[PDB]
Structure formats: C-alpha cells, structure tokens
Amino acid sequence: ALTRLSQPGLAFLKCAFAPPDFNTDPGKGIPDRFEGKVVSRKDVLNQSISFTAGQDTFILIAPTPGVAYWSASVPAGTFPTSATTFNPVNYPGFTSMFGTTSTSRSDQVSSFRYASMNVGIYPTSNLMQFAGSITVWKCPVKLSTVQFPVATDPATSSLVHTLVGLDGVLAVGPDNFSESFIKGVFSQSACNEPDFEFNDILEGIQTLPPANVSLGSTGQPFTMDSGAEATSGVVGWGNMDTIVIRVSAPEGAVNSAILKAWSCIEYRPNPNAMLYQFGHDSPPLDEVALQEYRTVARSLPVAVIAAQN
Amino acid sequence: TQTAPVPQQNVPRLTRLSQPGLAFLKCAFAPPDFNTDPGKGIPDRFEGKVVSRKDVLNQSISFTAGQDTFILIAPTPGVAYWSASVPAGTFPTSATTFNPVNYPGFTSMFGTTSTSRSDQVSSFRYASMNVGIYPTSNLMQFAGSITVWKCPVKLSTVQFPVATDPATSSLVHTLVGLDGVLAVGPDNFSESFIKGVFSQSACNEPDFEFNDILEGIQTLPPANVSLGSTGQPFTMDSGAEATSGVVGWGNMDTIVIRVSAPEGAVNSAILKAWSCIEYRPNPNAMLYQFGHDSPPLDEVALQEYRTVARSLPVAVIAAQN
Amino acid sequence: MAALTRLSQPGLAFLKCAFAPPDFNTDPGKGIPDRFEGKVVSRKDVLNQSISFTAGQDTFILIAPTPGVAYWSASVPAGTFPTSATTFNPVNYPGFTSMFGTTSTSRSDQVSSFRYASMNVGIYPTSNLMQFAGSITVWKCPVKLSTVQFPVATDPATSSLVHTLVGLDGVLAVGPDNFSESFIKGVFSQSACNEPDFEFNDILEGIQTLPPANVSLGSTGQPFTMDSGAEATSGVVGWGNMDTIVIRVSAPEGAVNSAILKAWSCIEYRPNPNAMLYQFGHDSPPLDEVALQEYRTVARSLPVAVIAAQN
Amino acid sequence: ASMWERVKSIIKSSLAAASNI
Amino acid sequence: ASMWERVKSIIKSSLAAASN
Amino acid sequence: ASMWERVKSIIKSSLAAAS
RNA sequence: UUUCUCUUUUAUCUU
Ligand SMILES: [Ca+2]
Ligand SMILES: [Ca+2]
Ligand SMILES: [Ca+2]
Ligand SMILES: [Ca+2]
Ligand SMILES: [Cl-]
C-alpha cells in the first residue's frame, strides 16, 4: 500500500512526522509541483535543559530559520507578560548560513519553505525528584505589520514588522497535550497554508518590536530578542504554526531533560555560496503524498509522550 | 574551425461533490436562497484549525437625490462596505473619502484599539463575498439606476523619501487598483434602481492562501501621508479606532455599486452583505471553542467554483437572488 | 503523437510562449492554464536591440521579473564582477509609459497586479569571423524582493523598513550550473516560475531605486545598486516569481562584438476597469493539469542556456 | 432559487459536457 | 507504537478506506 | 536541432513513462 | 534522445 507513494513522497512524510524514528536522511524535499534547485537543510538540535523550580518555562518552536526555539520563564501559574522577553537557542551553524551582521542574512540563501518542524523533550531527572507537567498547544503566529504615525519633522508614518497571534501563548490552548513531566513529549507542526509557498529571507531583524519601537505600539504581548547580530537573528518566518510548550516546575522540583528539535527546510541557494554545491531539484509532484500529509497531520494527537516518538 | 568547444558540466537529464464542497458552492453563490448558512469552510488542501464566521448585514438606506452614491464591497474583514456620494454624473475625486459600515460585532472580533486587531484571530481567508440591494421605494417616487462592476483592488505599498533629519525613506500601505472605481467597468450590470440587484465576488487568486491580520490601520493614506504620495485616487477612512478599522485585505475582487438618484428621487432600499470567512483562531480567544478543521480537498468543488464564477452574469436583479 | 494531444489548446500555447518563442510566426501565448479564470490582459513583450559591446570590459546583463523592463545592465572592468560601486540601468520594452505612466506614483493606473508566464532572452552575434572575441556566460539567481529593518536616529528616534533585493550576491560568482561559450556562438536561455504555483503579485508604487533614496547601500545588504532613472521614462513596478537570468559578456581589448539582443515576456495582468487596456482582456485559461506538469518537467530538464543556433 | 437553480444548471451543464469522456 | 508506526497505519488505513 | 523540438522531445519522453 | 545486458553501488518497500 505504501508503494503508491514516490520514493521522495515517502521520505517527505518521514521527515514531516517522525524524524527521530530514522537513523538518517529523512527527506529529499517537498513533493509538490516545484522542481527548481534547492538545498535540503536538516536542522537538528540537542540541548540539555534544566527548568528552574517555582517557574513555568515557556518554549516556542517557531518557524524561524536557523533558530531551534525561543524561551522565557515566568512565575509558577502565570504566563508571559509585557515584561517578558524570549531568547533563542540556535541550530548548529547559524552564522555559517546567515552571517555575522543583521544585513548579511541573504548572502548564502535567498528564500525558503519549511518541510517539517518537530520537537521532543526527554526527561533526564530521577523518579524521586521531578514534579510538574509538560503542556503543549499550537498557535497560528504570523509575521505581519503595524502602521502608526510618528511626530518627527516633517511628521511621518511608520510601518514595521509585528507578530500577530502571539496572544495565543497567554493561555493553554483548548486543543492541547498535558501530562506529567517525567513522561516527556514529542510533537510536530505542519504547514499552515494550502500549499508550500516560498518566503524571502528577511534582512536586519534583531528584535520584535524593532529598536526604537515601543511594544504596545506593535500590539505584541511580549518581546522577541535574538540578541547580538553576530550570533543570531530573525531571518524569516515560515508557514508553520508555532509549537508552544509549557514546562511547569513546582518549588523543590529537579526537572531536567534533553531537548531535540528537527527541521527539514528547502532553501533556494545563491550561486556564490558553497552551499550550492549540494543543491538538487525539489522532488516532483506526488499527489498521494500531498494528500496523505494533510490526512496524517489532521489524524495525529497534539503531542505524545516521549516514549512514543 | 580550429577552436575547441568549452566543456559543459551539470546538465539536466463520474465523481460528485462532498458535503462541505457542495455547501462551499452555496455560501459562495447563493446565500439568500437558504434558510441557513450552508457554508462549512474551504474544501481545499488545507485542513488546519479554523473558525468559520458568516457575516451578514441588513442596512436600511436612503440615497440622496441629485447624488451618485458609490458603495464598495471590499475584502476588509469586519466591514460590510465603504460608502461615499458625489454629485450626479461624477465619480470619486481626490476630494472624496469613503467610510466603512461595520458588520455586527466588529469590536468583539477586533478590539477597540488600532493595535488590538489580532487579539482574537491571527489571519484569515474569504470563502465568499456577496451583496444585495432590495428597493423599498414605491413605484412613482423612485427614479434612477444601479450599476455594478468589479475591481482588482490589492493592498500594495509605496516607497518615497522624506526630508527628516537625518534624511529618511518611507514605505507605507497603498491601495492599487482604486482608479478602477473612477469609471463604469466595461463588464457591468446596469438597470433601473427599482429592480434592485444581487451580485457576488470570487477569489482573485489561483488558490485560497491565508492573509494576515493587519495592525494599526485606520486610514489609507495613513496619518502624516499625503494622498499625492500614495498614488491613490481617493481616501479610505475607517474612523474611530474604537468603532472600526482596516484589519486586513482579502483576495477577492472588490464590488463597486453606483446608485444614481436624480434630482427629486426618493430612492430607499435595504442593503444586505454576506461574507463567509475562515479565520485562524488564537488558542487564548473565546472564539476558538467554536472552531473545527477546514474541510478536506474536494477537486470537483474547486473546479466547479471556477466554472460557475466565470459563467454567472456580473449581477442580477433582486428578483433573482 | 499521443502526448501533445492531451493538452488543451491554451495549455499547448502556454508551453510554447514559455520555452521556444522565436520558433513562431505568432506568439501562441494566451494565459496561464491554472485554476484562475478571472479577467486578465495577456501581453507578450518583445525587445529587439542591435547592441555593440564595449571592448576591454565585461558587460553584465540581468533579465529580471520587473514588468515593462526587458533587462538591466552595467559594465565593469575586464575579469571583475559588480561591486558596491556598480549601478544597473534598466532597458525598457516598447511602451513602458503607456503601461505604467510617467510618475513613480502612477504605476497602478492601468493594471493592479501581475504574474509572469515566461521570460526568455537571446543574443545573436552579428560580428564577422575577423572581429569577434570573448565569451558569453549565463547562470540563474533566485533574486527576490524582500525588506530590511533598521533603526534611524531621527527626533524622535524611529525604525525604518524598506525594500531590499535578496540574493543579488549570486551575481558576483559564476555558479557551478552555467552556460559558457564563445561569443560568436551566441546564446538563448529561459527562466521559469520559482514558486509551486502562479500567484499574482501587486504592482509596486514609488520605486525608482534600490536602495531607495536616503538609504545607504550598506544598510540594505545589497551588493550593488539598481537605478531605473527618470520616473518619466522607467521604474520598478513590481517583482515577479521567476528566477533572474544573469549574463556575462566579456569582450577583450581590440575586439568588435556586435549582436542583436532579444527578450520575451509573457505576462498576465489584472486590468483596471477604467483602463483603456481592459477592452483587450479575456478570462485566464482554465486548468490544464497536463500542461502544468509538462511545464515543470520541461523546465528542469532544459539546460541553463543553449547556443544561439538552436532557439 | 432563481440563483441557486442558475448555479445547479451551470454545474450540470459543465459536469455533463465533461462526462462524455 | 513508535510515531512512524502510528503514521504508517494512518496512511494504510486512509489509502484503504479510499479504495471503496 | 530546434528549441521547440528539443522541448517536444522532453514532453514525449516523460509522457512515455506515464503510458 | 537513441538499444540492451553485467556487475554494480547505494536506497527504500515487503516477509
Ligand atoms: Ca495584539
Ligand atoms: Ca498560494
Ligand atoms: Ca493612481
Ligand atoms: Ca547581502
Ligand atoms: Cl534595432
């Protein structure tokens, strides 16, 4: 029955929903009509992470190229507030792809499309010390814009990037996975569009809201700060819903784990980049794979415990 | 003849419609014909979480005699239509400003601040946009016409320099395609006002991609920008941020209706506006518990949609809505 | 055969305007055979230009998805590539102004949006065997029109957001996938949709240069500059979804390289009801699965470019 | 439904002109 | 049921229920 | 060979693995 | 774009 899928169509499905179940080469690209030259970046992160007791740590797996996730901790029982700032944890090689200044992001690649985005949390604490839970839900966060006037001379109108839908992080979504911390979790996101469109690499974005822009004039409930341009940045926003994970560690809890993140991304390489050497045509259309992708995604649970990744 | 060729390397070598698909075609082309909104979502590839809102507006309205009133059914979520009137025989000028009439519950969906627009939903996509005008005037008091045509209005951007200190460059939203309102489109419906009218728009893109919610827009041209800078033929002013605003611009052509009341004409009617929209709910919204998944791809429906849309007349009299 | 008969008429024509335009008495082109069947105006732009290349210099030509403009060029010192000191100037298809007006803010007066079907180019040497010298190298770049965000210390302090061409850096090196041959053999090349589907792009208003006025090249990330010149003669009215064809014509000191340059563009525009242009419109052709598939296949199966003797 | 019937007519008119393989 | 297993069954189950 | 012929070949070669 | 064998040599899918 799985023979009705093309070789790539099948590989595609694997990178998409179960990258941890395979030893290597999960996918060769997206089996959609597009067959232009691309480079399949297999992003994988292995981050050891300890959650501070009395704090509810929030992790966001966003479709931001090169950056595995963003996080911030808040007092137990609370959510991110205007006072919160999320900080990123990069995938190995961020600068090897996006440079060291906020304006050299499109040097290697010019655009991209996410094929998969998965995350797993594997508890490493003992059974007598942990406590708390892991809660997961997904938010339709998009990168839009905000229009406002500034009293400069002459008076002018500003237009800047702004993240819409972040408000979804301020409450546990009705569709969610919630279970004991010790059981860990595995979850994946899916394309939030009727198809896989390419998005452009974005230059100069180091923070949202931007420098010289006040939160609140943006509408965002909190801040995204990538930090030093020489180490990280927001080079784009893919069409995938954001995975929100809330690990709540009670006072006295000793919760630690190993976090793993996977991202299959098709990048359009520039001829002057060495990355181009590894390009190839995106796989041909595989109507069956594209249809099963949608079915499988809709059929799976929000998340599953670690042991079932 | 004695020049060796340069080596070249790396050279290439009887199906029927689903329930949601049928319902999709009903919300799309004939909403007044059903006891209930038949709509259920867009039967395209996408099957993620959405909330289907069926917006309907009932507006009793009177047209100023000696005026040519212009109504714009645009893909602006929450806002039924935009209106403005000019002296009979003329079209909107730079001196003109359109004002929005909200669908019921605008604030419940988009807040009361120009930066609260994406608090409930983050993005959207139109499934349908219909409009109808039902004359209520007696036979001897009315006079005039109703004319309809459709415009490919898109929300683009304009780039111009500003002599601030230091010198700066501005980039702001700007509606392209508005110039199409300054003349009656060759493809149009035109008939006695009393006969009323019913018309519908359709996706102006090869597919139903999601558009994002836009924060801060209250006017176009925006504050501190001259109409000259934008290239727009006129102005769109949504007014008080606590009552309305421009939360987004969908992928549907804009319906332009021009009601012509000559001098001494008593032209009264009821205007209805339908709008089937699929929104992406925010987990925190109270709106979310009403959500479901967009319906599965239904090839037949997606092709019938395009065929039907192309086969229908620009508009029809109210008697055949 | 039973391969070219499964295609709808428009589908067949689509494949032709797309891959081999010189081969016809008339452009078969009639629109894109995809789901979209709304009102459009199909325009097949063709540029014919006798051109003579500057000896001792490498001339760079860019066939970009910029409506109304055939190509952008700039010449640099032999053996070098465009630098921050370089500026490209657009060469327009006939009737630019009748399509996009004469001021940077009247670009959306006739049409509001567009989408490319094809974009081809050809160079036909006209030099004799005693005067030509040099080479023609072609490769393609995935150049897109994005944006850059940066702070400006005005009073009060503010944040700017402006257009930036992303992936322009690809022009500074001849990628491993290229066509390279003696000038005398000429060349023919085409570009294809760099997206999985043919979506419409909006007409852009007010763009005369990139980086725009009052913005330093440095803050945009672009490796060089794009200057359309007088708003009354040219400008960038949009950026389509086709990859950019880069061509490097290198002429040695003392060589006479003359040629005829041709450029084709099959574009589908959304006409404005008020435009005079509209009376020429029709509905975009209906979906033709076969054609949409052959397109993709043929596209990735064709070489970067071929010598002129075969177009 | 002089509009829904107009649509049903178009649907069967094309679903029939394309069912004669 | 590893994720892949859970997925394969959904596919086979889908491809089968669609052969009716 | 011609360009339309080079293309007419790629169409009939791939439409050969389709039937 | 052209024709097969042969070993390749990986790579999935099935017991
Ligand atoms: Ca908000
Ligand atoms: Ca799309
Ligand atoms: Ca204008
Ligand atoms: Ca750069
Ligand atoms: Cl000439």
Coordinates of C-alpha atoms and ligand atoms in Angstrom, one line a residue, chain A residues 103-104 106-107 203, chain C residues 169 221-223, ligand 4:
Chain A
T103 CA 22.4 42.7 6.9
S104 CA 24.2 39.6 5.6
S106 CA 20.6 36.7 2.3
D107 CA 24.3 36.1 1.4
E203 CA 17.3 41.4 6.5
Chain C
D169 CA 25.0 38.4 -4.2
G221 CA 22.7 44.3 2.3
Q222 CA 22.5 44.6 -1.4
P223 CA 25.9 44.1 -3.1
Ligands
CA4 CA 23.9 40.8 1.2

